Amino acid sequence: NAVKEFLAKAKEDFLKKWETPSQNTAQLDQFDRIKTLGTGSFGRVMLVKHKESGNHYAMKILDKQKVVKLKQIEHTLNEKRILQAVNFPFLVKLEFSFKDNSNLYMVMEYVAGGEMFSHLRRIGRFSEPHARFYAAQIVLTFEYLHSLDLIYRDLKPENLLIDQQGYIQVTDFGFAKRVKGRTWTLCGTPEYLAPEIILSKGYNKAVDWWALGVLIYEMAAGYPPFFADQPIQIYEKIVSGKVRFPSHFSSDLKDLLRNLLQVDLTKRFGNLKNGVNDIKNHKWFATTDWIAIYQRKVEAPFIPKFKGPGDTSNFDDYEEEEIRVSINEKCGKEFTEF
């Protein structure tokens, strides 16, 4: 009952901050752009420093005209609404939020380690204790996000950020959605799609547990379990239900992946009667102290290079381009809701 009431109290903070969302609470002159952390068609992510507080934050700017053009406002609606209503040690904290002419802004806590993708690719493959450390944080995050009826729908190393102490900070909530029944929106990444999403059928929260099985596989092997020359061959492999494990996979890891990467929805872990405890009690997490992970008392097996503050040594410099501002408010009526 000690954990059953904690999540019940977390659902109260959620629904409270959910029905009446936050409002604009800063000006763009408070933060100067130091360097570009990321970019895309919808917008960009810059490293900005608080001129009134002397600290760094992560400012994600989104071009308002482009968001209307790419048919993504609802995804910006839900992402902004979910990121202010949730609170978890492994989720990113939306420090500030303020709309402006031609742009929308989201000031998040600056994660100094970058994506897990770069570290995994650089290192090659994580060890099972190293991967078990990262998998546990995802399990406790999926357990808390599922209690709030939320589905993440885009789990991949490109959207997992390693903070300063070696822990995981989840960022991209573009396809996040609060839903109690089922959904039918085809979204994600081909290598990480569950077989039901591929067969154009209705899917539920169990697709987040298929992604966990793919994610653990990629961390422990260095490559995803379903890859091919053409995306159609990837969709064929996923629905086929055949997974080949590397030589160095422990028998316990092979068992957990066979339960997670289960094409049969009625036998997949996390979607059974016992719920999330199917995975936390597995013999692979038999060295994991879950409460110590949540309290963040477990020593990290890997620490990102953080010799000094403001160092983007773990990110890519890209090209530095300023933000185009207008005198005419490009804010559509929907952007009032943000």
Binding site: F117, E158, F175, P190, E191, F227, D229
Partner: peptide, 17 residues
């Protein structure tokens, strides 16, 4: 567990239609 190709190991991009 096949012959690894560099294109599959690059940064994957999300999608929705």
């Amino acid at each position: 567990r096949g012959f690894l190709r560099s294109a599959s190991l690059g940064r994957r991009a999300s999608f929705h239609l």
